[PDB]
Every structure is written in C-alpha cells, then in structure tokens.
Ligand SMILES: *c1c(F)c(=O)[nH]c(=O)n1[C@@H]1O[C@H](COP(=O)(O)O)[C@@H](O)[C@H]1O
C-alpha cells in the first residue's frame with residue numbers, strides 16, 4: 001500500500017470523512033472503512049469513496065457470526081464494492097471458511113484478525129491468537145491483522161504466517177503503538193485518530209510518512 | 215417476550231423482510247435484526263420495523279471491536295432506535311464495558327454473547343465461555359446469549375448467570391436445536407430460517423409456539 005499507511009476512517013459524518021480523506025489522499029493508497037462510518041452514512045459510502053478517491057477499500061467489519069450469516073455479510077460487503085473484508089478468527093474455522101468462499105466467488109480478499117490491539121485482548125484472544133494464525137495458514141489465508149501495541153506478538157504472528165503473507169497492524173498513535181517498531185514486522189500500519197482528529201490531518205499523515213521513510 | 219419466541223429476520227430484501235415479519239407478528243414480541251438486513255437496506259430499517267410492527271428490536275451486531283469503536287457502534291445503533299444490542303464477550307471486559315456505558319447513557323440494553331451455536335464455536339469460544347459469562351456477572355450484565363445446539367452448555371451458562379438474568383438462545387431449527395430442550399434453560403428462543411424460509415412462515419411460527427405451550 002502507498003507509503004505503508006492505511007487510513008482508518010472512523011469519522012461518522014460523510015462531509016468530515018470526505019474532507020479528511022481528500023486531505024490525506026496523496027499519502028495513502030488504502031482506506032479502511034468500518035461500522036462507525038457505515039452505520040452512520042450507509043453502505044453506499046464504500047462505492048463513493050472508491051470512486052471519488054480511487055483508493056482500495058478494506059471493510060473493517062470484524063465479522064464474527066456463524067458461517068451462514070458470515071456468507072451474507074461478506075456478499076453484501078463485496079456487492080457494495082469493498083476490495084477486502086476483515087474477519088475475526090476467534091469464532092473458528094468454519095466461520096472463516098465461509099468468508100473465504102464468498103471472497104473466492106467474487107474475486108476479493110479476506111484479512112484474518114488474529115490478536116486485537118486493546119488491553120482486553122489479553123483476556124481471551126491473546127491465548128488463542130497463535131492458533132488463530134496457524135488456522136489461517138491451514139486455510140490458505142494470505143492476509144492478516146495483528147497488534148501494533150504488542151510488537152513481540154507481531155513478531156510471533158509474523159513467524160507463524162511467514163514472509164509471503166501480508167500483515168497490517170492497528171494501534172499506532174492513539175493506542176500507543178509506534179510506526180517504526182510496528183513496520184519491523186507488519187507490511188503496513190493502520191492509523192485512525194492520530195490523523196483524523198489532528199488539527200491538520202495532512203500534516204499528521206506527512207509526519208508519519210517522514211518517520212516511515214527513515 | 216411474547217410466546218418466548220424472537221424472530222431472527224435475516225432476509226436481505228426490505229419487501230420480503232416486511233412481508234414475513236407482518237405474517238408472524240401475532241406470534242412474536244421481538245424482532246432480531248442483524249447485518250444481513252441492515253447492510254442491504256440501511257439502518258433506517260430498524261426504526262421502520264419498530265414503528266410498523268410495534269415490536270422491540272434487538273440489533274444483533276455481535277460487536278467485537280476495541281472500546282472506542284464499540285462505543286461508536288452502540289451509539290449509532292441506539293440512535294437508529296434499537297432497544298438492545300448483542301455484543302461479543304471474547305474481546306474482553308473493556309470492550310464490553312464500553313457498550314454498557316453507552317447503553318446506560320441512552321437507557322438501552324446490552325446482551326452478552328457467551329458461547330456461539332455453530333460447530334466452530336468449539337475451537338476457541340467454548341473454552342472461554344464460562345469465564346465470559348462470569349465476566350458478564352462481574353460487570354453487572356443482566357442479558358445473555360448462549361447456544362441452543364448445546365443444552366448442557368446452556369445449563370452451565372444458566373448456572374453462572376443465575377435465575378434473575380435473561381438468557382436468549384439461537385440455533386433452534388435449522389442448526390439442530392430443539393425449542394423444548396432449549397427453553398428448559400433459556401427464557402426465549404431465537405428462530406430465523408425455520409420461520410423465514412418456510413413456505414408459510416405464520417404456520418411455522420404457530421407450530422413452534424404449539425411445541426412451546428406444551
Ligand atoms: C480493530 C482491531 F481488531 C484491533 O485490534 N484494533 C483496532 O484498533 N481496530 C480498529 O482499528 C482502528 C484503530 O484506529 P485508531 O486507534 O488509530 O484510531 C479502528 O478502526 C479500530 O476500530
């Protein structure tokens with residue numbers, strides 16, 4: 001992705017979301033759109049962003065239902081124009097496979113969320129996360145999400161998924177993660193609030209790239 | 215809830231969803247709306263259903279993000295008129311607390327999803343599910359979801375949450391669960407496909423109630 005930086009666009013107003021994304025477009029390739037924006041403005045926002053900015057769109061829906069419903073969610077999300085969807089691994093292999101089947105049907109991609117970045121991830125997810133990553137490898141998943149806030153865990157996750165796999169990482173900035181130490185292991189960093197709440201989002205994005213280019 | 219039966223309305227077309235829900239309205243109190251319908255027709259569908267049928271609406275969004283984003287998702291969902299939201303416990307106590315805080319602000323309810331009903335739930339969720347339920351009790355959660363497909367697990371979950379707590383249960387019918395054996399432990403059963411894919415959804419709903427009334 002351009003400059004190894006993915007914008008987490010979690011503003012809830014279409015005008016603010018369009019403004020900030022336009023301001024930082026020269027620094028990014030890829031916009032991650034989640035439920036804060038979609039549940040506020042509708043699924044049409046995906047196609048609008050894709051068209052207006054010409055950026056790849058990852059739908060960060062952290063899909064975590066039964067196989068049947070996961071299929072439905074993925075179908076609707078790809079129909080809306082998303083290039084990829086983020087799905088949780090914790091619900092197990094059948095739920096993940098359902099997403100992979102739809103992505104196959106529609107020539108799109110699945111990212112498997114292994115360990116989450118927030119403190120509560122330590123309670124239950126962390127203990128399962130290595131296994132979740134191996135399950136991904138066993139299912140042929142090539143794209144993964146893991147936590148900027150725990151680079152030792154990123155390292156381990158990278159070890160499991162191999163060098164070929166594509167690994168993106170949230171928790172940079174607001175949650176305490178560092179761009180440099182995350183990119184030792186991840187291919188790309190996800191950044192939301194440090195950019196979209198900044199007085200000058202372009203300056204914030206540019207500053208992050210300036211720490212990446214080194 | 216009326217007749218202890220909650221309709222899982224996962225059709226993806228507004229007209230079909232309205233038709234089936236209208237047909238079974240005399241048998242239900244409560245409609246569960248999830249992402250299959252919302253991602254197809256928009257969040258406005260919640261207020262439409264609530265108004266047109268005068269039914270309580272549970273938004274089954276299986277919320278599974280970090281605290282900050284969970285707050286945003288819950289806010290948008292209650293703003294759209296939902297009475298309650300289903301959230302995953304697996305991401306940990308902070309993520310659950312975030313949802314409880316918004317439900318407090320807005321005089322609404324959270325249901326904590328403990329163990330899921332599908333086969334893949336055995337991989338990771340089942341091993342954490344008793345703890346997830348205890349975490350709920352420790353946070354003051356009063357409403358829970360657990361699996362019709364494993365009544366021995368329902369029993370254990372009921373044991374942890376106590377008799378006061380309200381427990382609803384999916385996996386009846388299509389997934390193999392039985393109305394009678396689920397209602398030994400759950401207060402209400404969730405039923406989707408057995409009703410909404412039936413040639414006569416009212417007859418299917420009525421048949422389920424006829425097995426409940428006994
Ligand atoms: C999702 C997830 F599964 C994580 O483990 N961590 C995480 O933060 N998210 C989502 O990533 C973005 C982080 O944005 P920022 O903290 O930079 O504002 C958000 O979209 C969050 O939902």
Ligand SMILES: *c1c(F)c(=O)[nH]c(=O)n1[C@@H]1O[C@H](COP(=O)(O)O)[C@@H](O)[C@H]1O
Pocket residue numbers: 065066069222224248274276327329330331332361384385386387388389404405406407408
């Ligand atoms: C969600 C969940 F967390 C479960 O453990 N099981 C489950 O099935 N769901 C959702 O409940 C409904 C079941 O409907 P049915 O199988 O009767 O068609 C669906 O909305 C499913 O997403």
